[PDB]
Every structure is written in structure tokens, then in C-alpha cells.
Amino acid sequence: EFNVVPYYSWFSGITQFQKGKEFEFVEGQGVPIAPGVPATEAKGYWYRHNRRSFKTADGQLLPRWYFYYLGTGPHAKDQYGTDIDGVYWVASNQADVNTPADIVDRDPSSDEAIPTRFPPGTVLPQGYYIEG
Ligand SMILES: Nc1ccn([C@@H]2O[C@H](COP(=O)(O)O)[C@@H](O)[C@H]2O)c(=O)n1
């Protein structure tokens, strides 16, 4: 969970389940589908949430990534494509990444997270489980 309230993603997360596997998409891919959003607005980034478990006397919790439209979320002011640890930038070939997406953030319980799905043809990152 989060002990500091997060910026809320419109979408469900993508959880790592195999070590060493890289979170990636093919250029032009990796923007989750939201009804009615034009392709020109399909631009943003996945943000890594590093998770931490507590110590037991048993025997580790891998990161989960969340999507934010460009100009929103915890890296709202960073430039598209810039090398930042824990930020993976994605955009439709139709999007102009110089301009923020004109896309209101989500919440209250005015709207729940949209289950993450990608269009046919999307190369899915092996070793990751899409929540939902
Ligand atoms: N910083 C954030 C932003 C949204 N969320 C949300 O939590 C849900 C995803 O569940 P999991 O974290 O268990 O994958 C979605 O509703 C998603 O938007 C989150 O867990 N951390």
C-alpha cells in the first residue's frame, strides 16, 4: 500500500512477477485503452512503485507499475523521453509529446480504475502481470 497518498492512476497496475525481466514496450505502444480518448492524447509514462515487505521468520515483493498521462502524476513536470529511474515513457505515434495530455486526473470514488488493456498487436512485456 501507500503511507503517503499517491497520485491516482486512471488504470490498474502492471506487476512484476519474474526477476530480471525488464519493463518495456515497443515505441508507439504501451498506452492503456480508455474509452473515447483520442490517440493524440495517448501519451504518458508508467511509474514504478517499489514495494517492500516486512521481515518474518519464514523466508521479495516486486515492483508494480502505474500509468500517468503526460503532465500528470508524480512526474508531471518531467520531459517526455528523459532518462529517469522508475519512469518508462510511452506514446501513440499520433501524439505530440511536447504538450501535456488534456486529461483530468481520477477520483474521488467518482470513478474506479479502468482495467489495463492494450490494443491488438501490442507486444506485452514478458514477466509482468497486468492487474485485472
Ligand atoms: N500511486 C498509485 C495510483 C493508483 N493505484 C491503483 O490501485 C489499483 C491497482 O491495484 P494493485 O496496486 O493491487 O495493482 C488501481 O485502482 C490503480 O489505479 C495504486 O495502487 N498506486
Side-chain angles (χ1 to χ4, degrees):
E1 48 160 66
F2 302 75
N3 69 289
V4 167
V5 171
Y7 292 94
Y8 282 80
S9 173
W10 268 108
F11 305 95
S12 62
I14 299 184
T15 310
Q16 190 172 6
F17 71 85
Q18 295 184 340
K19 256 72 116 186
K21 291 306 287 198
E22 201 77 344
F23 185 89
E24 56 185 6
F25 288 100
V26 175
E27 184 171 15
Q29 303 176 14
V31 183
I33 299 164
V37 171
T40 49
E41 298 291 44
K43 40 184 173 179
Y45 59 98
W46 291 90
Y47 176 65
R48 187 178 45 204
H49 184 213
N50 289 313
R51 267 159 108 209
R52 246 212 106 139
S53 56
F54 53 83
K55 185 179 233 209
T56 168
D58 285 287
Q60 281 177 3
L61 225 74
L62 293 173
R64 177 177 282 139
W65 299 70
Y66 291 99
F67 179 85
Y68 298 93
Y69 287 104
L70 184 65
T72 77
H75 290 289
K77 64 188 167 292
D78 297 284
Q79 174 189 45
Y80 189 96
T82 190
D83 197 337
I84 300 174
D85 191 38
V87 177
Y88 192 93
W89 302 96
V90 291
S92 170
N93 291 141
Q94 310 288 294
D96 181 358
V97 290
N98 287 338
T99 52
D102 165 33
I103 311 264
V104 234
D105 298 289
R106 166 170 83 89
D107 236 15
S109 287
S110 279
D111 292 274
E112 205 96 320
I114 296 164
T116 289
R117 61 174 290 235
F118 299 105
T122 303
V123 175
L124 297 173
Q126 305 72 18
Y128 291 81
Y129 173 70
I130 306 179
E131 299 287 335

CSV table of all heavy atoms in Angstrom, one decimal, residues 1-2 4-15 47 49 51 64-68 74 106 111-114 129-132, ligand 1:
chain,number,residue,atom,x,y,z
A,1,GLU,N,0.8,-1.2,0.0
A,1,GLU,CA,0.0,0.0,0.0
A,1,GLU,C,0.9,1.3,0.0
A,1,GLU,O,2.1,1.2,-0.2
A,1,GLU,CB,-0.9,0.0,1.2
A,1,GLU,CG,-0.3,-0.3,2.5
A,1,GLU,CD,-1.1,0.1,3.7
A,1,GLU,OE1,-2.2,-0.4,4.0
A,1,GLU,OE2,-0.6,1.0,4.5
A,2,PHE,N,0.2,2.4,0.2
A,2,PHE,CA,0.9,3.7,0.2
A,2,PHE,C,0.6,4.4,1.6
A,2,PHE,O,-0.5,4.5,2.0
A,2,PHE,CB,0.3,4.6,-0.9
A,2,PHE,CG,0.5,4.0,-2.3
A,2,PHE,CD1,-0.3,2.9,-2.7
A,2,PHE,CD2,1.5,4.4,-3.1
A,2,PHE,CE1,-0.2,2.4,-3.9
A,2,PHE,CE2,1.6,3.9,-4.4
A,2,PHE,CZ,0.8,2.8,-4.8
A,4,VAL,N,1.9,7.5,2.1
A,4,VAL,CA,1.7,8.8,1.6
A,4,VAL,C,0.7,8.7,0.5
A,4,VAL,O,0.9,7.9,-0.5
A,4,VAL,CB,3.0,9.6,1.1
A,4,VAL,CG1,2.7,10.9,0.4
A,4,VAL,CG2,3.9,9.8,2.3
A,5,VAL,N,-0.4,9.4,0.5
A,5,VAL,CA,-1.4,9.3,-0.5
A,5,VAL,C,-0.8,9.5,-1.9
A,5,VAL,O,-0.1,10.5,-2.1
A,5,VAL,CB,-2.6,10.2,-0.3
A,5,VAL,CG1,-3.5,10.2,-1.5
A,5,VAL,CG2,-3.3,9.8,1.0
A,6,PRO,N,-0.9,8.6,-2.8
A,6,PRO,CA,-0.4,8.7,-4.2
A,6,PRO,C,-1.2,9.5,-5.1
A,6,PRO,O,-2.4,9.8,-4.8
A,6,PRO,CB,-0.5,7.2,-4.7
A,6,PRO,CG,-1.7,6.7,-4.0
A,6,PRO,CD,-1.7,7.3,-2.6
A,7,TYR,N,-0.7,9.9,-6.2
A,7,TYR,CA,-1.5,10.4,-7.3
A,7,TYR,C,-2.2,9.2,-7.9
A,7,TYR,O,-1.5,8.1,-8.0
A,7,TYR,CB,-0.6,11.1,-8.4
A,7,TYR,CG,0.0,12.4,-8.0
A,7,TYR,CD1,1.3,12.4,-7.4
A,7,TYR,CD2,-0.7,13.6,-8.1
A,7,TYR,CE1,1.9,13.6,-7.0
A,7,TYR,CE2,-0.1,14.8,-7.6
A,7,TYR,CZ,1.2,14.8,-7.1
A,7,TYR,OH,1.7,16.0,-6.7
A,8,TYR,N,-3.4,9.3,-8.2
A,8,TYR,CA,-4.2,8.1,-8.6
A,8,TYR,C,-4.1,8.0,-10.1
A,8,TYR,O,-4.2,9.0,-10.9
A,8,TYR,CB,-5.7,8.1,-8.1
A,8,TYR,CG,-5.8,7.7,-6.7
A,8,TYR,CD1,-5.5,8.6,-5.7
A,8,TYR,CD2,-6.0,6.4,-6.3
A,8,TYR,CE1,-5.6,8.3,-4.3
A,8,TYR,CE2,-6.1,6.0,-5.0
A,8,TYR,CZ,-5.9,7.0,-4.0
A,8,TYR,OH,-5.9,6.7,-2.6
A,9,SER,N,-3.8,6.8,-10.5
A,9,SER,CA,-3.7,6.4,-11.9
A,9,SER,C,-5.1,6.1,-12.4
A,9,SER,O,-5.9,5.6,-11.6
A,9,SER,CB,-2.9,5.1,-12.0
A,9,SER,OG,-2.9,4.6,-13.4
A,10,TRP,N,-5.4,6.4,-13.7
A,10,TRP,CA,-6.7,6.0,-14.3
A,10,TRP,C,-6.9,4.5,-14.4
A,10,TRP,O,-8.0,4.0,-14.7
A,10,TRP,CB,-6.9,6.7,-15.6
A,10,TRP,CG,-7.7,8.0,-15.5
A,10,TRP,CD1,-7.1,9.3,-15.6
A,10,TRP,CD2,-9.0,8.2,-15.2
A,10,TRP,NE1,-8.1,10.2,-15.4
A,10,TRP,CE2,-9.3,9.6,-15.1
A,10,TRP,CE3,-10.1,7.3,-14.9
A,10,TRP,CZ2,-10.6,10.1,-14.9
A,10,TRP,CZ3,-11.3,7.8,-14.7
A,10,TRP,CH2,-11.6,9.2,-14.6
A,11,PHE,N,-5.8,3.8,-14.3
A,11,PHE,CA,-5.7,2.4,-14.7
A,11,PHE,C,-5.1,1.5,-13.7
A,11,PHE,O,-4.4,1.9,-12.7
A,11,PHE,CB,-4.8,2.3,-16.0
A,11,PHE,CG,-5.3,3.1,-17.1
A,11,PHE,CD1,-4.7,4.4,-17.4
A,11,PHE,CD2,-6.3,2.7,-18.0
A,11,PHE,CE1,-5.2,5.2,-18.4
A,11,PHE,CE2,-6.8,3.5,-19.0
A,11,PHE,CZ,-6.2,4.7,-19.2
A,12,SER,N,-5.4,0.2,-13.8
A,12,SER,CA,-4.8,-0.8,-13.0
A,12,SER,C,-3.3,-0.9,-13.2
A,12,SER,O,-2.8,-0.6,-14.3
A,12,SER,CB,-5.5,-2.2,-13.1
A,12,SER,OG,-5.3,-2.6,-14.5
A,13,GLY,N,-2.6,-1.5,-12.3
A,13,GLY,CA,-1.2,-1.6,-12.3
A,13,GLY,C,-0.7,-2.8,-13.1
A,13,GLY,O,-1.5,-3.7,-13.4
A,14,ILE,N,0.6,-2.8,-13.4
A,14,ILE,CA,1.2,-3.9,-14.0
A,14,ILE,C,2.3,-4.4,-13.1
A,14,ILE,O,3.2,-3.6,-12.7
A,14,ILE,CB,1.8,-3.5,-15.4
A,14,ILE,CG1,0.7,-3.1,-16.3
A,14,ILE,CG2,2.6,-4.7,-16.0
A,14,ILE,CD1,1.2,-2.8,-17.7
A,15,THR,N,2.2,-5.6,-12.6
A,15,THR,CA,3.0,-6.2,-11.5
A,15,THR,C,4.2,-7.1,-12.1
A,15,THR,O,3.9,-8.0,-12.8
A,15,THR,CB,2.1,-6.9,-10.5
A,15,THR,OG1,1.0,-6.1,-10.2
A,15,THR,CG2,2.9,-7.4,-9.3
A,47,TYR,N,5.0,4.5,-14.1
A,47,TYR,CA,5.7,4.8,-12.9
A,47,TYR,C,5.9,3.6,-12.0
A,47,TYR,O,4.9,3.0,-11.6
A,47,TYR,CB,5.0,6.0,-12.2
A,47,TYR,CG,5.7,6.3,-10.9
A,47,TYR,CD1,6.9,6.9,-10.8
A,47,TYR,CD2,5.0,6.1,-9.7
A,47,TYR,CE1,7.5,7.2,-9.7
A,47,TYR,CE2,5.6,6.4,-8.5
A,47,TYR,CZ,6.9,6.9,-8.5
A,47,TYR,OH,7.5,7.2,-7.3
A,49,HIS,N,6.3,1.7,-8.7
A,49,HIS,CA,6.2,1.6,-7.3
A,49,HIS,C,7.0,0.4,-6.7
A,49,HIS,O,6.6,-0.7,-6.9
A,49,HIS,CB,4.7,1.5,-6.9
A,49,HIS,CG,4.4,1.5,-5.4
A,49,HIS,ND1,3.5,0.8,-4.8
A,49,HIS,CD2,5.1,2.2,-4.4
A,49,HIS,CE1,3.5,1.0,-3.5
A,49,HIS,NE2,4.5,1.9,-3.3
A,51,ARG,N,8.1,-1.8,-3.6
A,51,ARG,CA,7.0,-2.2,-2.7
A,51,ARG,C,7.4,-2.6,-1.2
A,51,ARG,O,6.6,-2.2,-0.3
A,51,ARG,CB,6.2,-3.3,-3.3
A,51,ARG,CG,4.9,-2.8,-4.0
A,51,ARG,CD,4.5,-3.9,-4.9
A,51,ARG,NE,3.3,-4.6,-4.6
A,51,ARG,CZ,3.1,-5.9,-4.9
A,51,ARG,NH1,3.9,-6.5,-5.7
A,51,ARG,NH2,2.0,-6.5,-4.5
A,64,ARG,N,5.4,-2.8,-8.9
A,64,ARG,CA,4.2,-2.6,-9.6
A,64,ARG,C,4.2,-1.3,-10.3
A,64,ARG,O,4.5,-0.2,-9.7
A,64,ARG,CB,3.0,-2.7,-8.7
A,64,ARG,CG,1.7,-2.5,-9.4
A,64,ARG,CD,0.6,-2.7,-8.4
A,64,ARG,NE,0.3,-4.1,-8.2
A,64,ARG,CZ,0.0,-4.6,-7.0
A,64,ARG,NH1,0.0,-3.8,-5.9
A,64,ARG,NH2,-0.2,-5.9,-6.9
A,65,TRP,N,3.9,-1.2,-11.6
A,65,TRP,CA,3.9,0.0,-12.3
A,65,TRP,C,2.5,0.5,-12.6
A,65,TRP,O,1.6,-0.2,-12.9
A,65,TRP,CB,4.6,-0.2,-13.7
A,65,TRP,CG,6.1,-0.6,-13.6
A,65,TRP,CD1,6.6,-1.8,-13.2
A,65,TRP,CD2,7.2,0.1,-14.0
A,65,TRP,NE1,8.0,-1.8,-13.3
A,65,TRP,CE2,8.4,-0.6,-13.8
A,65,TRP,CE3,7.4,1.4,-14.5
A,65,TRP,CZ2,9.6,-0.2,-14.1
A,65,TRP,CZ3,8.6,1.9,-14.8
A,65,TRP,CH2,9.7,1.1,-14.6
A,66,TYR,N,2.4,1.8,-12.6
A,66,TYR,CA,1.1,2.6,-12.8
A,66,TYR,C,1.3,3.6,-13.9
A,66,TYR,O,2.3,4.3,-14.0
A,66,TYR,CB,0.7,3.3,-11.5
A,66,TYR,CG,0.3,2.3,-10.5
A,66,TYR,CD1,1.2,1.9,-9.5
A,66,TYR,CD2,-1.0,1.8,-10.5
A,66,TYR,CE1,0.8,1.0,-8.5
A,66,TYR,CE2,-1.4,0.9,-9.5
A,66,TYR,CZ,-0.5,0.5,-8.5
A,66,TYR,OH,-0.9,-0.3,-7.5
A,67,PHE,N,0.3,3.8,-14.7
A,67,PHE,CA,0.3,4.8,-15.8
A,67,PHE,C,-0.3,6.1,-15.5
A,67,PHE,O,-1.4,6.2,-14.9
A,67,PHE,CB,-0.5,4.2,-17.0
A,67,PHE,CG,-0.5,5.2,-18.2
A,67,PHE,CD1,0.5,5.3,-19.1
A,67,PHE,CD2,-1.6,6.0,-18.4
A,67,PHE,CE1,0.5,6.1,-20.2
A,67,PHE,CE2,-1.7,6.9,-19.5
A,67,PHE,CZ,-0.6,6.9,-20.4
A,68,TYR,N,0.4,7.1,-15.9
A,68,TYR,CA,0.0,8.5,-15.8
A,68,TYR,C,0.1,9.2,-17.2
A,68,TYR,O,1.1,9.1,-17.9
A,68,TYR,CB,0.9,9.3,-14.8
A,68,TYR,CG,0.7,8.7,-13.4
A,68,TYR,CD1,1.6,7.7,-12.9
A,68,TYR,CD2,-0.3,9.1,-12.6
A,68,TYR,CE1,1.4,7.2,-11.7
A,68,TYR,CE2,-0.5,8.6,-11.3
A,68,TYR,CZ,0.4,7.6,-10.9
A,68,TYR,OH,0.2,7.1,-9.6
A,74,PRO,N,3.2,11.8,-10.4
A,74,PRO,CA,4.4,12.2,-9.7
A,74,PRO,C,5.5,12.7,-10.5
A,74,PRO,O,6.4,13.4,-9.9
A,74,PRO,CB,4.8,10.9,-9.0
A,74,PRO,CG,4.2,9.8,-9.9
A,74,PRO,CD,2.9,10.4,-10.4
A,106,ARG,N,-8.0,11.3,-11.9
A,106,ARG,CA,-9.1,10.5,-11.4
A,106,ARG,C,-9.3,10.6,-9.9
A,106,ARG,O,-8.4,10.7,-9.2
A,106,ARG,CB,-8.8,9.0,-11.7
A,106,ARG,CG,-9.8,8.0,-10.9
A,106,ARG,CD,-9.7,6.6,-11.3
A,106,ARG,NE,-8.6,5.8,-10.7
A,106,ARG,CZ,-8.7,5.1,-9.6
A,106,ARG,NH1,-9.8,5.2,-8.9
A,106,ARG,NH2,-7.7,4.5,-9.1
A,111,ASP,N,-14.9,7.8,-9.8
A,111,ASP,CA,-14.5,6.8,-10.8
A,111,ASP,C,-13.5,5.8,-10.3
A,111,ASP,O,-12.5,6.1,-9.7
A,111,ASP,CB,-14.0,7.6,-12.0
A,111,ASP,CG,-15.0,8.4,-12.7
A,111,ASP,OD1,-15.7,7.9,-13.6
A,111,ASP,OD2,-15.2,9.6,-12.4
A,112,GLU,N,-13.7,4.5,-10.6
A,112,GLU,CA,-12.8,3.5,-10.2
A,112,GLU,C,-11.7,3.3,-11.3
A,112,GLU,O,-11.9,3.8,-12.4
A,112,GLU,CB,-13.5,2.1,-10.0
A,112,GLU,CG,-12.8,1.2,-9.1
A,112,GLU,CD,-13.3,1.3,-7.7
A,112,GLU,OE1,-13.6,2.4,-7.2
A,112,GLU,OE2,-13.4,0.2,-7.0
A,113,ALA,N,-10.6,2.6,-11.0
A,113,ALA,CA,-9.6,2.3,-12.0
A,113,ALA,C,-10.1,1.5,-13.2
A,113,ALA,O,-10.7,0.5,-13.0
A,113,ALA,CB,-8.4,1.7,-11.4
A,114,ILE,N,-9.8,1.9,-14.4
A,114,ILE,CA,-10.0,1.2,-15.6
A,114,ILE,C,-9.0,0.0,-15.7
A,114,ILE,O,-7.8,0.3,-15.7
A,114,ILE,CB,-9.8,2.1,-16.8
A,114,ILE,CG1,-10.8,3.2,-16.8
A,114,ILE,CG2,-10.0,1.3,-18.1
A,114,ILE,CD1,-10.5,4.3,-17.8
A,129,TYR,N,2.6,-9.1,-14.9
A,129,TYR,CA,1.2,-9.5,-14.9
A,129,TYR,C,0.4,-8.2,-14.9
A,129,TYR,O,0.5,-7.4,-14.0
A,129,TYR,CB,0.9,-10.3,-13.6
A,129,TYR,CG,-0.6,-10.6,-13.4
A,129,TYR,CD1,-1.3,-11.5,-14.3
A,129,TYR,CD2,-1.3,-10.0,-12.4
A,129,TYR,CE1,-2.6,-11.7,-14.2
A,129,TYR,CE2,-2.7,-10.2,-12.3
A,129,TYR,CZ,-3.3,-11.1,-13.1
A,129,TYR,OH,-4.7,-11.4,-13.0
A,130,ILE,N,-0.5,-8.1,-15.8
A,130,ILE,CA,-1.5,-7.0,-15.8
A,130,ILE,C,-2.6,-7.2,-14.9
A,130,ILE,O,-3.4,-8.1,-15.0
A,130,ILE,CB,-2.0,-6.7,-17.3
A,130,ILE,CG1,-0.8,-6.6,-18.2
A,130,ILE,CG2,-2.9,-5.5,-17.3
A,130,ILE,CD1,-1.2,-6.4,-19.7
A,131,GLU,N,-2.8,-6.3,-13.9
A,131,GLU,CA,-3.8,-6.4,-12.9
A,131,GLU,C,-5.2,-6.3,-13.5
A,131,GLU,O,-5.4,-5.4,-14.4
A,131,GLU,CB,-3.7,-5.4,-11.7
A,131,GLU,CG,-2.3,-5.6,-11.0
A,131,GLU,CD,-2.3,-6.8,-10.1
A,131,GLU,OE1,-3.3,-7.3,-9.7
A,131,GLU,OE2,-1.2,-7.3,-9.8
A,132,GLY,N,-6.1,-7.1,-13.1
A,132,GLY,CA,-7.4,-7.1,-13.7
A,132,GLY,C,-7.6,-8.2,-14.6
A,132,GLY,O,-6.6,-8.8,-15.0
B,1,LIG,N1,0.2,5.6,-6.9
B,1,LIG,C1,-1.0,4.7,-7.2
B,1,LIG,C2,-2.2,5.1,-8.2
B,1,LIG,C3,-3.3,4.2,-8.5
B,1,LIG,N2,-3.3,2.8,-7.8
B,1,LIG,C4,-4.4,1.9,-8.1
B,1,LIG,O1,-4.5,0.7,-7.4
B,1,LIG,C5,-5.2,-0.2,-8.2
B,1,LIG,C6,-4.3,-1.3,-8.7
B,1,LIG,O2,-4.2,-2.4,-7.8
B,1,LIG,P1,-2.9,-3.1,-7.4
B,1,LIG,O3,-1.9,-2.0,-6.8
B,1,LIG,O4,-3.1,-4.1,-6.4
B,1,LIG,O5,-2.3,-3.5,-8.8
B,1,LIG,C7,-5.8,0.6,-9.3
B,1,LIG,O6,-7.1,1.1,-8.9
B,1,LIG,C8,-4.8,1.7,-9.5
B,1,LIG,O7,-5.2,2.9,-10.2
B,1,LIG,C9,-2.2,2.4,-6.8
B,1,LIG,O8,-2.2,1.3,-6.3
B,1,LIG,N3,-1.0,3.4,-6.6
